[PDB]
Amino acid sequence: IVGGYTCGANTVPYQVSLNSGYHFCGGSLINSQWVVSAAHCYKSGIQVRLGEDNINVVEGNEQFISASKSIVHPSYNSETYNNDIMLIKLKSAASLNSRVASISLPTSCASAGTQCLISGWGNTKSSGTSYPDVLKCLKAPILSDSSCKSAYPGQITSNMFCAGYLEGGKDSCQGDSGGPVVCSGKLQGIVSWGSGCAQKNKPGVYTKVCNYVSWIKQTIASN
Numbered sequence: 001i002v003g004g005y006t007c008g009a010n011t012v013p014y015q016v017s018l019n020s021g022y023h024f025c026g027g028s029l030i031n032s033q034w035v036v037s038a039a040h041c042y043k044s045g046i047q048v049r050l051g052e053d054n055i056n057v058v059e060g061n062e063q064f065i066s067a068s069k070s071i072v073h074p075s076y077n078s079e080t081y082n083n084d085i086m087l088i089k090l091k092s093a094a095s096l097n098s099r100v101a102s103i104s105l106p107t108s109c110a111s112a113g114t115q116c117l118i119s120g121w122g123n124t125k126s127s128g129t130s131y132p133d134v135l136k137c138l139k140a141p142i143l144s145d146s147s148c149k150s151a152y153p154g155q156i157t158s159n160m161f162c163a164g165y166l167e168g169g170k171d172s173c174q175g176d177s178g179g180p181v182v183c184s185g186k187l188q189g190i191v192s193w194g195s196g197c198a199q200k201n202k203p204g205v206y207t208k209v210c211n212y213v214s215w216i217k218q219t220i221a222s223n
């Protein structure tokens, strides 16, 4: 997260860290047994880390649970990042508490201008690299589809949306991938792509979760 702030320990209780000997992506707890992340975060051998604040220190509220299954969206396209969503099943159900809690799926798509909270342990620099150990947060509004598509002509599909700031300075970034965009108490987005980070007229692009809620629900019910 570039231009954001320290969230505070466990203030984003649905945020998870995907770990394969190291943090490599974020994700969102949508119920005690399942996480939503980005398809581009796919890898084998994932451990889901819940209740995390400092990902390099055991602070006492962590739950480490291995994935039992990954499901990349049937139509994910790695060339264009279209349908950039994946489901991860936890080997054992998370124990829910104040610091480990699920986030609601939406029932409608969000309107331009709605404020959202985006979070993650991604790069905090727009130029160069710096990776933080505690979770960072950013408030960002959903941008008009026309400003989104004009920023990235030919490359935004109706399964994507832009949020952030055209002026730059404030954005998600590498390492935030797969993490949540939560708006009005619902998971409306997943950190997906962008050109660099916090660059002018290049806002973040996010997987439009409202277009996937029936797939999510059908898939989890059948697995």
Ligand SMILES: N=C(N)c1ccc(O[C@H]2CO[C@H]3[C@@H]2OC[C@H]3Oc2ccc(C(=N)N)cc2)cc1
Pocket: 040, 171, 172, 173, 174, 175, 176, 177, 191, 192, 193, 194, 195, 196, 197, 198, 203, 204, 205
């Ligand atoms: N694992 C690989 N080899 C891999 C997978 C995905 C890659 O690139 C895609 C395209 O861009 C995304 C995604 O992962 C890296 C980059 O992460 C972000 C996240 C946020 C923003 C933004 N809000 N400005 C920009 C890029 C590349 C290699």
Ligand SMILES: [Ca+2]
Pocket: 052, 053, 054, 055, 056, 057, 058, 059, 062
């Ligand atoms: Ca920790």
